[PDB]
């Protein structure tokens, strides 16, 4: 057994955005329905120091 620290809750700042398709686009807006990370979301922060 060993000691441990309580987990914290951080907040993302517009993260988790990738390319939903392999199509080259330039100067054109595109919207699709795919899995992404919401903006200003609170996730569980795990420490290991």
């Amino acid at each position: 057994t060993r000691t441990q620290l309580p987990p914290a809750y951080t907040n993302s700042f517009t993260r988790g955005v990738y390319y939903p398709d392999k199509v080259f686009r330039s100067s054109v807006l595109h919207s699709t329905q795919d899995l992404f990370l919401p903006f200003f979301s609170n996730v569980t922060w795990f420490h290991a120091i």
């Binding site: 398709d21 392999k22 199509v23 080259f24 686009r25 100067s27 054109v28």
Partner: protein, 50 residues
Amino acid sequence: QFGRDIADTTDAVRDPQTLEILDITPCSFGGVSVITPGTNTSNQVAVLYQ
């Protein structure tokens, strides 16, 4: 390997083997017009394109 434009259409496919950027340009577009200056005073016509 694919690419679109403002028209949201596929017209610039990249070759996965050659790795050369090539564009798509079809040659099947336009129409055929006919010019006939009457049928009682003239008999010759002229083909008109678009």
